[PDB]
Design a protein around this motif. Structure first.
Motif, PDB file in Angstrom:
ATOM      1  N   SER A 142       0.791  -1.252   0.000  1.00 29.00           N
ATOM      2  CA  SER A 142       0.000   0.000   0.000  1.00 29.00           C
ATOM      3  C   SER A 142       0.828   1.310   0.000  1.00 29.00           C
ATOM      4  O   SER A 142       2.046   1.284   0.200  1.00 29.00           O
ATOM      5  CB  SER A 142      -0.965  -0.008   1.186  1.00 29.00           C
ATOM      6  N   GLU A 143       0.147   2.447  -0.185  1.00 23.43           N
ATOM      7  CA  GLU A 143       0.802   3.787  -0.218  1.00 23.43           C
ATOM      8  C   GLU A 143       2.135   3.728  -0.986  1.00 23.43           C
ATOM      9  O   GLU A 143       3.219   3.918  -0.414  1.00 23.43           O
ATOM     10  CB  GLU A 143       1.028   4.368   1.189  1.00 23.43           C
ATOM     11  N   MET A 144       2.042   3.433  -2.279  1.00 23.82           N
ATOM     12  CA  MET A 144       3.206   3.406  -3.122  1.00 23.82           C
ATOM     13  C   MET A 144       3.165   4.583  -4.075  1.00 23.82           C
ATOM     14  O   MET A 144       2.159   4.770  -4.799  1.00 23.82           O
ATOM     15  CB  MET A 144       3.244   2.111  -3.922  1.00 23.82           C
ATOM     16  N   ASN A 145       4.247   5.372  -4.106  1.00 27.42           N
ATOM     17  CA  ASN A 145       4.343   6.468  -5.085  1.00 27.42           C
ATOM     18  C   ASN A 145       5.581   6.435  -5.934  1.00 27.42           C
ATOM     19  O   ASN A 145       6.666   5.993  -5.500  1.00 27.42           O
ATOM     20  CB  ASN A 145       4.244   7.836  -4.420  1.00 27.42           C
ATOM     21  N   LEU A 146       5.394   6.891  -7.163  1.00 24.47           N
ATOM     22  CA  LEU A 146       6.474   7.145  -8.063  1.00 24.47           C
ATOM     23  C   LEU A 146       6.632   8.642  -8.207  1.00 24.47           C
ATOM     24  O   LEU A 146       5.631   9.393  -8.304  1.00 24.47           O
ATOM     25  CB  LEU A 146       6.191   6.527  -9.398  1.00 24.47           C
ATOM     26  N   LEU A 147       7.893   9.081  -8.194  1.00 28.53           N
ATOM     27  CA  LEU A 147       8.203  10.489  -8.317  1.00 28.53           C
ATOM     28  C   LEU A 147       9.282  10.745  -9.355  1.00 28.53           C
ATOM     29  O   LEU A 147      10.357  10.089  -9.370  1.00 28.53           O
ATOM     30  CB  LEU A 147       8.588  11.084  -6.977  1.00 28.53           C
ATOM     31  N   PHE A 148       8.970  11.715 -10.212  1.00 29.29           N
ATOM     32  CA  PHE A 148       9.759  12.049 -11.390  1.00 29.29           C
ATOM     33  C   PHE A 148      10.287  13.460 -11.256  1.00 29.29           C
ATOM     34  O   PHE A 148       9.526  14.363 -10.892  1.00 29.29           O
ATOM     35  CB  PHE A 148       8.899  11.900 -12.652  1.00 29.29           C
ATOM     36  N   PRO A 149      11.577  13.667 -11.588  1.00 31.53           N
ATOM     37  CA  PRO A 149      12.219  14.956 -11.327  1.00 31.53           C
ATOM     38  C   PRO A 149      11.625  15.961 -12.278  1.00 31.53           C
ATOM     39  O   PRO A 149      11.491  15.687 -13.491  1.00 31.53           O
ATOM     40  CB  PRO A 149      13.698  14.712 -11.666  1.00 31.53           C
ATOM     41  N   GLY A 150      11.220  17.102 -11.731  1.00 31.95           N
ATOM     42  CA  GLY A 150      10.597  18.122 -12.534  1.00 31.95           C
ATOM     43  C   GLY A 150      11.668  18.931 -13.215  1.00 31.95           C
ATOM     44  O   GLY A 150      12.836  18.564 -13.179  1.00 31.95           O
ATOM     45  N   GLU A 151      11.263  20.050 -13.825  1.00 29.32           N
ATOM     46  CA  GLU A 151      12.184  20.969 -14.510  1.00 29.32           C
ATOM     47  C   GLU A 151      13.287  21.539 -13.627  1.00 29.32           C
ATOM     48  O   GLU A 151      14.420  21.664 -14.075  1.00 29.32           O
ATOM     49  CB  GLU A 151      11.400  22.105 -15.132  1.00 29.32           C
ATOM     50  N   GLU A 152      12.943  21.898 -12.389  1.00 35.77           N
ATOM     51  CA  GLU A 152      13.907  22.436 -11.422  1.00 35.77           C
ATOM     52  C   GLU A 152      14.181  21.405 -10.331  1.00 35.77           C
ATOM     53  O   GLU A 152      13.285  20.654  -9.949  1.00 35.77           O
ATOM     54  CB  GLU A 152      13.350  23.714 -10.743  1.00 35.77           C
TER      55      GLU A 152
END
Lengths: 158, 164
Positions: free
Chosen positions: B125-135
């Motif tokens: 549960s509570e799994m996130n993917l995070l992708f680096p933004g422009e900054e």
């Protein structure tokens, strides 16, 4: 695995819910003769018992039961199973929606009329749908990958 | 939830695997600065510690860790996460595949290069993917689904599932 009861065996109606609770190693089923489409049935805290629900009800809730067997007519909305291990569920009639959560070793035996059942599952394992017996395994593993060209996650059965 | 440890705080090489074990409430990051693509890394029984793997290795196996942070280079094949809670994993390089099983509150931070990572998930549960933004310091956060629906397809004689 052993359920811890919260009182004596009971079956009783509070408001519109038939509460079935603390049934342990019964050699005789607990039978719900009564109740209409207006009722919910809530079965909690039971081990090695058989529960028979005769009348079609609005919804069934089964929580924290282990090694139990259920024979039910059907429901207007859904059957909600949470935190149960080794459960058998058979329908006489129609069950449109079933929900499995934090549960393992659940066998669902459908009826001719109700083969179209929608099963929601989460954090559950060893789940089977059974058509009259054809045994289909509900998947318990998924794959997710980022669609860059669409800015969303996409997921599939593995 | 408190991890049942198993011995001394350990960083040692067994055959071709680095065992990184029993690191509880470490003030300092534990860094593994050696290794190659021939090696595996196993991280077990750890709580509130930063772990850092400098080299790209074959694969990494992480079990029974709680409120840990991992910084990794990348892997040839996969990172396997089993029975973990409150886990943050970040990569600077390539991680082709990640697998999460019986785990909760896991955040995965991808490199620009490793955006296309495949995450396998079961009983978690509570799994996130995070992708680096422009900054730098910007992260696009995307939640991995943890519930599915299954129907018998009669005209095809099998089950079909999809995200809820």
């Amino acid at each position: 695995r052993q359920v811890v009861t919260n009182g004596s065996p009971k079956v009783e109606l509070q408001k519109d819910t038939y509460l079935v609770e603390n049934h342990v190693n019964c050699a005789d089923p607990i039978t719900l003769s009564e109740g209409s489409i207006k009722n919910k049935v809530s079965v909690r805290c039971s081990q090695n018992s058989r529960i028979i629900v005769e009348q079609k009800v609005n919804s069934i809730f089964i929580e924290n039961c282990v090694g139990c067997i259920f024979l039910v007519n059907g429901v207007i909305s859904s059957i909600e199973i949470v935190n149960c291990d080794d459960i058998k569920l058979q329908m006489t009639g129609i069950v449109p929606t079933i929900s499995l959560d934090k549960s393992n070793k659940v066998n669902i035996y459908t009826s001719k009329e109700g083969k179209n059942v929608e099963v929601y599952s989460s954090k559950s394992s060893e789940m089977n749908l059974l058509f009259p017996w054809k045994e289909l395994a509900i998947p318990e593993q998924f794959v997710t990958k980022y669609n860059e060209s669409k800015g969303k996650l996409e997921s599939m059965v593995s």
